[PDB]
Structure formats: C-alpha cells, structure tokens
Design a protein around this ligand. Structure first.
Ligand SMILES: OC[C@H]1O[C@@H](S[C@@H]2O[C@H](CO)[C@H](O)[C@H](n3cc(-c4cccc(F)c4)nn3)[C@H]2O)[C@H](O)[C@@H](n2cc(-c3cccc(F)c3)nn2)[C@H]1O
Ligand SMILES: OC[C@H]1O[C@@H](S[C@@H]2O[C@H](CO)[C@H](O)[C@H](n3cc(-c4cccc(F)c4)nn3)[C@H]2O)[C@H](O)[C@@H](n2cc(-c3cccc(F)c3)nn2)[C@H]1O
Lengths: 133, 133
C-alpha cells in the first residue's frame, strides 16, 4: 500500500523520473507501471534478498490480472540504505529503465498500451520525488 | 481528471512540494488534499477567471461529501502561461500553504486527519514535479 499515482498519461517518448530512499533492512522493492493494478506493462522488482533471490532485479508483466514470464538481470546497481533514482520511458517495442550512473535495463512491451497512466511503489522504498517529462 | 496520488502518508510537519505549469488560457485549477475525493482537508482553487470570480484564491474543505465554509485570499500570485510551485504542510490546527514565493496563508484543519494520504490535481494545471519531505 505504498505510493500510488493514477492518470499519469505518460505517452511514448516521455520520461518518468522517480527518486526515493531504500531502507537499510531492504529485502526488495517494487515499481509498478501500466494502466492499473491489474494491467502492468512493467513490474520492476529489485531483490536484495526476497523469495530466494540475492541481489537480482526481477521484471515481469501483468495482463488482465495474470502475471507474465519473469525476466532476470545479472546486474544489480542498488544498495540498501541509500537513495535510488530511475528514469523510465517506453516505445512500441520495449520499456527502458535508466539509472543516472549509466545502467540501462530493457523489458519487452508486452501490453502495447497507449500510455502509462498508473504508477505504484511498494516494499522497502519510500519515494521522495516524482517528475514527468 | 488530472493527476491523482494516493497513500501519500504525509505526516504533520512533512512538506508536500508540487510544481506544475499553468496554461496560458487558464481559467482555474485545483489542488485537493485529504483522505479521498469525499474528504478534503484542503481544496485549493486559484480562480483566474471562474464562477464569476477573478484572480482570487478560493479555499474550502470537504467533509463526507459536503463542502465546508468557503474562504478567499485577496492576494493572487499566479500568472497564466507560467510555472507555479506550491508547498504545503499542516498541524492539527491549520494547513500552511506557501505560494510563489514569499506568500504564506493559513487554512484551518477542519478534518483533523492523521495524515494526508490523498492528492488530486485538476483544471488548467499540468503537474511536472511532486516532492515529499
Ligand atoms: O510462481 C511462484 C513464483 O512467485 C515468485 S515471487 C512473485 O513474482 C512476481 C514477479 O513475477 C512479483 O514479484 C510478486 N510480487 C512481489 C510483490 C511485492 C509486494 C510488496 C513489496 C515488495 F517488495 C514486493 N508483489 N508481488 C512476487 O510475489 C517467485 O519469484 C517465483 N520464482 C522464480 C525464481 C527463480 C529463482 C532463481 C533463479 C531463477 F532463474 C528463478 N524464484 N522464484 C515463483 O516462486
Ligand atoms: O454554492 C454556491 C457557491 O459556489 C461556489 S463554486 C464551488 O466552490 C467549491 C469550493 O468552495 C468548489 O471549488 C467547487 N468546485 C470547483 C471545481 C473544479 C473542478 C475541476 C477543475 C477545476 F478547476 C475546478 N470543483 N468543484 C465550485 O464549483 C462559489 O465559490 C460561491 N461564491 C461565489 C462568490 C463570489 C462571486 C462574485 C464575487 C465575489 F467576490 C464572490 N462567493 N461565493 C458560491 O456561489
């Protein structure tokens, strides 16, 4: 039940910037993006230690309430007890999550939604700032 | 039907910073703060030209769907076609609103709420930045 933002109307090309602080006892946190809570074109879930994963980013989609296939990244540029910033955009092919220091993750656009109208944060991540570009 | 943010969990003393761009032909816009759409401890409505009023800030509350006693500020530090930032805090007595950028007025806390969990923007005001401190 973390921060939820609706009616974002984030169209392709536009950038969603999110800055927040990661808890010191961080297990994992979640950034959800899509149309609503049941239609997520991006489930961004860095896991420090959660569900057996250690220092692993887990991405997925949810379509009509149904989870898609999990995609995993070896690179884990997140440290517990620190401030994490992500820049998010998308096109017809992929969603792109960029980190300031150069890290960039791609996740296939599986929902093909016209825009991102929904953002929800959860887990050990307290959002401090959100910008729309 | 503008931006809506829920589960803010804004405790007393904490600052809610909101930046957005006011349309050149703006008639009015709204910042709603409270628990939900039916319970607003602050209805912040600058009216450039609306409901017969002009260059007047209209503040009110909504408690259980019912509008409280409307109140107005003689001062109007908003320009159509320009970027406006509003900083908002509250104690158990008043809400404090900081307008661009020397301006500060108190609005009585009439809902007594523990925290601000709900923000909704509307009217001729496209949100570009929201910060929580
Ligand atoms: O079929 C059961 C599966 O369940 C998921 S976890 C589940 O998956 C989703 C992603 O698809 C969401 O992350 C979801 N979620 C998290 C939150 C949340 C809520 C609040 C805060 C916060 F932070 C987070 N809400 N929803 C998770 O519960 C397991 O990973 C998966 N599995 C696959 C592997 C696996 C392990 C090692 C290597 C490998 F390749 C795969 N290790 N487990 C398998 O056991
Ligand atoms: O009952 C009649 C009253 O009606 C309100 S209008 C009403 O006020 C509410 C707050 O008090 C809400 O703002 C409400 N609202 C706005 C929006 C919205 C929704 C979407 C976008 C967007 F931008 C905005 N939604 N809801 C308004 O409709 C007038 O203030 C009021 N009155 C007028 C005067 C008055 C008149 C002339 C001169 C003068 F000095 C005072 N002095 N009192 C009086 O005539």
């Amino acid at each position: 039940c973390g921060l939820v933002a609706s009616n974002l109307n984030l169209k392709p090309g536009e950038c969603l910037r999110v800055r927040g602080e990661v808890a010191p006892d961080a297990k994992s946190f979640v950034l959800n993006l899509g149309k609503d809570s049941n239609n997520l074109c991006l489930h961004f879930n860095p896991r420090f230690n959660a569900h057996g994963d250690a220092n692993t980013i887990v991405c997925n989609s949810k379509d009509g309430g149904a989870w898609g296939t999990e995609q995993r990244e070896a690179v884990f540029p997140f440290q517990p007890g620190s401030v994490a910033e992500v820049c998010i955009t998308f096109d017809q092919a992929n969603l792109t999550v960029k980190l300031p220091d150069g890290y960039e993750f791609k996740f296939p656009n599986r929902l093909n939604l016209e825009a991102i109208n929904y953002m929800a944060a959860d887990g050990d991540f307290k959002i401090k700032c959100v910008a729309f570009d």
